[PDB]
Paper text:
Aldehyde dehydrogenase 1A3 (ALDH1A3) belongs to an enzymatic superfamily composed by 19 different isoforms, with a scavenger role, involved in the oxidation of a plethora of aldehydes to the respective carboxylic acids, through a NAD+-dependent reaction. In particular, the ALDH1A subfamily is composed by three different isoforms (ALDH1A1, ALDH1A2 and ALDH1A3) which are involved in the conversion of retinal, an important mediator of vision, to the retinoic acid, a potent tissue differentiation factor for cellular development. Previous clinical studies highlighted the high expression of ALDH1A3 in cancer stem cells (CSCs) correlated to a higher risk of cancer relapses, chemoresistance and a poor clinical outcome.
NR6, showing the best inhibitory activity at 25 μM, was investigated further to determine its IC50 (5.3 ± 1.5 μM) and Ki (3.7 ± 0.4 μM) values, which revealed a potent and competitive model of inhibition. As detailed in the experimental procedures, we co-crystallized ALDH1A3 and NR6 and solved the complex structure at a final resolution of 2.9 Å. The final model contains two identical chains per asymmetric unit, arranged as dimer and a total of 38 solvent molecules. Our crystallographic data revealed that, in all monomers, NR6 binds to the enzyme at the entrance of the catalytic tunnel, and no direct interactions between the catalytic cysteine and the ligand are present. The NR6 heterocyclic cores lie in a conserved hydrophobic pocket located at the entrance of the catalytic tunnel. In this conformation, the phenyl ring in position 6 of the nucleus establishes contacts with the protein backbone, with Van der Waals contacts and hydrophobic interactions with the residues G136, R139, W189, N469, A470, L471 and Y472. Indeed, the cyanide group blocks the inhibitor in a rigid and conserved pose in both the monomers. As clearly shown in Figure 3C, the Y472 strongly binds and coordinates the pyridinic ring of NR6 with an edge-to-face π-π stacking interaction. All these interactions are further stabilized by a hydrogen bond that is established between the -OH group of the Y472 and the N1 of NR6 (3.7 Å). It is important to highlight that Y472 residue is not conserved in the ALDH1A1 and in the ALDH1A2, where it is substituted with a S461 and N478, respectively. Actually, the presence of the cyanide group promotes the distinct orientation of NR6 respect to Y472, thus stabilizing the binding with the protein and determining high selectivity towards ALDH1A3.
Author numbering:
A (entry chain A), B (entry chain B): 19 to 507
């Protein structure tokens, strides 16, 4: 029974969450969050700045202070708390999906069956990890006792983008909390509503005050305050590569806080001659056009082996025709509006760039109408490495298709980039599959699928696509400090 | 039969090591390395710069390229190569100890029975780890196969100081090499001889050319070229906290290369009333005066509980007077000269600061004589938190001793710092020992000992004393990138 849309439900939580209490800005300033579809203003949210960040950091330090209720808890009890938060999230699943779609213009069905699903699963997983975070006892000498503890790093700041506001937020809160940290979170300016509702849910679930604080605001104000705050021990950022460099160098400059970075990527897609062409084309269509093409794992490059190149292109064009584009709450829609104007502007500008460099076009190339921010699915052909459509992270609906002959060739080409978030390989041949998986400088390598994210499997970027990892057991390493204890007898 | 010092053996390796070949600096410039005890010039070493590092990085990139001899090697074969390097290190152990002591003025016995010992043990340990670097296979769905590979991160630059030139170099080379990386190393300007001799040994053992390249030179020229090189994937730095911040932020600005930082620390020493006062005094004396007090783990603050404060002070002073200080090659000496002229100057300057800020003095407080750069072992008393000898890393022979009453008190006081490298606790009480071990924000916590370093146990700093860890299995995490491979069926 697919739920029907929550038509016009009002917002309730719009203030700064600190010590389980709602506060007004120190300055009193407030900003507005708008609807990417209605093109009209949704509501107003408190606009925090450096003083509010100072207050939240103090709260988080007090909740983390030795002997605090949060510190004294059982590992199993922290896990139980995370499970409680997951239960609450599930109870209010439709409300959260509705807020998410209002804030991002994402299809309500997408928000219900993707964002919230991943949120719940991530919460459950890291809840399971809470009482299973184990260090080592080390052999050294007959008279010595040597072991390691994995302790919480302390206060952790989180900074998240607009494409998946809540999900990217859960990815950090879950592991950080199961390791017993305290947090200061900052949602994007565009989409702060889900984060504040989750703060209400955190309070309801019984987390001690000060363990999670939420301060909405703008990147250069609240973000900069967190990234260079002297009392924050860890920072986790997901966003653009440039702001990621800014954050990491601010952390280096301030207090040497540890940094996790989930950034962008020129994600390649590799189709081999022996592929299941139907599934390959379908998955490439998805990886290029899902969520309006605005996700960290967008396929920007598509290498096809000559033996099927033309056939692939043909089928690709075909598949692009039957793609729903309309109301986000529409049950038969797969693509909503864009986020703001700059992304739409530069997407059309680089479509125009590509058509002027010698690439055959077969689909779309314009905007449907001037009611929202919709673009027609575009499909390019006869693309080269030297073209901008093959070297710049697109972040939109466009499928540039290149041609290759050798395995070694496609390896060299795909790896020529500075990014390395994801890569996808489609082939039925065991040897080619495994050789490519081994050779691709990519943090995730999907084979005969796409967007296969799992709470149990680590996600992250090689090279300039990130530093640490989220999801999986690996996320735990970013939220713990190792201490050695050596005792002579 | 302990060997006597190799009296007057000439230096042989003084050039830039690249592709197993010795090169003169592109510029032709050279700098001079001197003997801190004889005060006379040891030798001249090639002074490399950005061009030299570019050449070395190109060598390392080609040696790491897919299909190279280094890549095609077996895990067990990499381990055997490391073991060969260890054998060679042991064969030439006396030459190397002589080089290190000539360069640093370290007691030759200390270099032979500590530095080279730790080097060989570290090499053996990480050689053992080579074929045991294993990822995971992850449960997900009935039709899915998910696993992770731990791959070499790529080209690794290493920057290491003068206090333990060869050891701090091995601490990086061993784990980096057992994981199948390639390296560009830069020893400190003061002490590059052991590194170049080690390069000769590296060639002899059979490492393919380009796997390890060494460019001596100064921090701002070669060091900066390394830290911000766009073709360096990882950086490992050991030195001062400020230069560490500089290095991490240059890495942030250049290409987001991963960073390991072993920095300084206000290493506390905590003596409880129920300690073995004799052992407490002996280990604190050693931890504050060993290697002339110029090591990362030097005890700069010594908290004593009132019940034993005065007696401790007495025994400490007495123990400090009877400490040999003379020729490093003299078999009955425990303290050689200082590092260079600036460090001796500032050590005496802060001795004067301490005596002029209100601390009772009982040992030294001036320079012994002017035959080398020697200082008499100094011991201060009745020092408080706010005094300069208790808040600035001493890095010399000086034992500031404070007084405490409570366990909670000493915990809060010790943790008030921004550093967190090491701490030492001396007590016979199980509960106090373990409670302190848990509460101290310290990367290493010795109990009833000091300077107990083990290749099997990770070493590193909390807070502003570092980022990653060296030694142990944990070091491996710093030299590998995690890749997820997900296959649908
Ligand atoms: N590089 C350019 O010249 C250029 C061109 C077009 C658009 N843009 C803008 O870049 C942004 C990309 O959007 P995005 O959300 O995917 O990535 P982002 O870089 O804007 O970061 C997303 C999250 O990080 C926060 N943040 C932004 N700057 C920060 C900073 N200096 N310090 C700390 N936190 C900061 C943001 O508040 C948000 O929560 C858009 O706002 C876009 O308008 C930039
Ligand atoms: N500016 C001052 O006020 C001042 C005064 C006296 C001494 N110093 C310096 O402090 C240092 C004492 O601490 P230390 O020598 O044990 O550790 P360190 O901080 O000097 O670092 C040791 C290693 O890092 C290298 N390095 C230095 N600067 C670098 C940079 N910008 N980029 C990359 N690599 C760099 C060095 O060549 C060396 O190999 C000395 O180097 C001394 O010259 C500074
Ligand atoms: N955490 C999380 C998260 C967030 C978003 C999406 C996903 C996600 C992505 C892909 C996916 N395929 C399956 C599946 C189910 C049955 C058979 C075969 C495959 C589940 N899947 C979940 C997970
Ligand atoms: N890796 C390494 C490394 C580097 C420098 C020094 C040391 C180091 C430091 C202290 C130490 N005590 C023992 C020992 C031996 C026998 C019985 C009890 C203790 C060995 N020890 C090695 C290790
Ligand atoms: Na908005
Ligand atoms: Na390996
Ligand atoms: Na007690
Ligand atoms: Na702690």
């Amino acid at each position: 029974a697919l739920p029907r849309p929550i038509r016009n439900l009002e917002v309730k939580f719009t203030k700064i969450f600190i010590n389980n209490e709602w506060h007004e800005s120190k300055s009193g300033k407030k900003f507005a969050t708008c609807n990417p579809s209605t093109r009209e203003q949704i509501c107003e949210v408190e606009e925090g700045d450096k003083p509010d960040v100072d207050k939240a950091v103090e709260a988080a330090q007090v909740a983390f202070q030795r002997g605090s209720p949060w510190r004294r808890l059982d590992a199993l009890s922290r896990g139980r708390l995370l499970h409680q938060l997951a239960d609450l999230v599930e109870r209010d699943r439709a409300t959260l999906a509705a807020l998410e779609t209002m804030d991002t213009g994402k299809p309500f069905l997408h928000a219900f069956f993707i964002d919230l699903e991943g949120c719940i699963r991530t919460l459950r997983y890291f809840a399971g990890w809470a009482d299973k975070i184990q260090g080592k006892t080390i052999p050294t000498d007959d008279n010595v006792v040597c072991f390691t503890r994995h302790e919480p790093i302390g206060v952790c700041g989180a900074i998240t983008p607009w494409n998946f506001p809540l999900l990217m937020l859960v990815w950090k809160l879950a592991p950080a909390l199961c390791c017993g940290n305290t947090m200061v979170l900052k949602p994007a300016e565009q989409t702060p509503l889900t984060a504040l509702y989750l703060g209400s849910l955190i309070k309801e679930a019984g987390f001690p005050p000060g363990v999670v604080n939420i301060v909405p605001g703008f990147g250069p104000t609240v973000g900069a305050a967190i990234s260079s705050h002297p009392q924050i021990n860890k920072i986790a950022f997901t966003g653009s590569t440039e702001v990621g460099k800014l954050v990491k160098e601010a952390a280096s400059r301030s207090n040497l806080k540890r940094v996790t970075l989930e950034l962008g990527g020129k994600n390649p897609c590799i189709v081999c001659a022996d592929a299941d062409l139907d599934l390959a084309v379908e998955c490439a269509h998805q990886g290029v056009f899902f969520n309006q093409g605005q996700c960290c794992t967008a396929a920007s490059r598509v290498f096809v082996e000559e033996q099927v190149y033309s056939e692939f292109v043909r089928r690709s064009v075909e598949y692009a025709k039957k793609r729903p584009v309309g109301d986000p709450f529409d049950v038969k829609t797969e693509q909503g509006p864009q986020i703001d104007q700059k992304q739409f502007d530069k997407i059309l500008e680089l479509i125009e760039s590509g058509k002027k460099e010698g690439a055959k076009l077969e689909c779309g190339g314009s905007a449907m109408e001037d009611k929202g921010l919709f673009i027609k699915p575009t499909v390019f052909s006869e693309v080269t490495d030297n073209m901008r459509i093959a070297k710049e992270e697109i972040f939109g609906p466009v499928q540039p298709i290149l041609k290759f002959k050798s395995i070694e060739e496609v390896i060299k080409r795909a790896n020529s980039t500075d990014y390395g978030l994801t890569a996808a390989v489609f082939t039925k041949n065991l040897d080619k599959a495994l050789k490519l998986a081994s050779a691709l400088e990519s943090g995730t390598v999907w084979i005969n699928c796409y967007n296969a994210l799992y709470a149990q499997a680590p996600f992250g970027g090689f090279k300039m696509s990130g530093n640490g990892r989220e999801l999986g057991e690996y996320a735990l390493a970013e939220y713990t400090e190792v201490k050695t204890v050596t005792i002579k007898l």
